[PDB]
Design a protein around this ligand. Structure first.
Ligand SMILES: Cc1ccc2c(ccn2CC(=O)N2CCC[C@H](C(N)=O)C2)c1
Ligand SMILES: [Zn+2]
Length: 139
C-alpha cells in the first residue's frame, strides 16, 4: 500500500484504488497501473522533473529503504494477475531489488523529489510506475 499526496491530488496504484478514489476520480490509466483522485487537504509531497536513473525506494516487506539503479520508463510485458490480464504496462521502470505484492505503493525518490511508486515485482526485481511526466500534478 501507499500513495503520493501533491497539491489537491492523491496518486495511487490503480489496482489498489478505493471506492472513495473512484468517486473523486481525476484521471486513470490501466496501461500504467495509475489512478489520481482529488483531495480536500493540501498534500505533503514534491514531484521530481528530471531524468535520474538512481534513487531510493521504500520496501514495506522489509520496513526499509533501498538504493536502486532503474531503467528509463518503457513498455514492459507483465504476466496476468487477479487484477489485470497479461499485457504491456507502459511508463514502467525496472530495477534489481526486493519486492512482494503488498509492496505496491512504496515511493521511489531521487534528490529532486518523488519519481514514482512500486507497481510490479519479480524474483529479485522491482518495477516502478513513473509519475515525472504528469506535469499537471503541480500545475
Ligand atoms: C515474486 C513476485 C511476484 C509478484 C509480485 C512481486 C511484487 C509485486 N508483485 C505483484 C505484481 O507484480 N503484480 C500484481 C498486482 C498488479 C501488478 C501490475 N502492475 O500489473 C502486477 C513479487
Ligand atoms: Zn532526479
Amino acid at each position: 500500500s501507499g500513495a503520493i499526496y501533491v497539491g489537491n491530488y492523491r496518486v495511487v496504484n490503480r489496482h489498489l484504488a478505493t471506492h472513495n478514489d473512484w468517486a473523486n476520480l481525476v484521471w486513470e490509466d490501466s496501461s500504467r497501473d495509475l489512478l489520481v483522485s482529488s483531495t480536500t487537504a493540501q498534500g505533503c509531497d514534491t514531484i521530481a522533473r528530471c531524468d535520474c536513473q538512481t534513487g531510493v525506494y521504500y520496501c514495506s516487506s522489509r520496513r526499509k529503504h533501498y538504493p536502486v539503479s532503474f531503467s528509463k520508463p518503457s513498455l514492459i510485458f507483465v504476466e496476468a494477475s487477479e487484477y489485470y490480464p497479461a499485457r504491456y504496462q507502459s511508463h514502467l521502470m525496472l530495477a534489481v531489488g526486493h519486492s512482494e505484492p503488498g509492496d505496491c505503493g512504496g515511493i521511489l525518490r531521487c534528490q529532486h523529489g518523488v519519481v514514482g511508486i512500486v507497481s510490479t515485482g519479480g524474483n529479485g526485481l522491482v518495477g516502478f510506475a513513473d509519475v515525472r511526466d504528469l506535469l499537471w500534478l503541480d500545475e
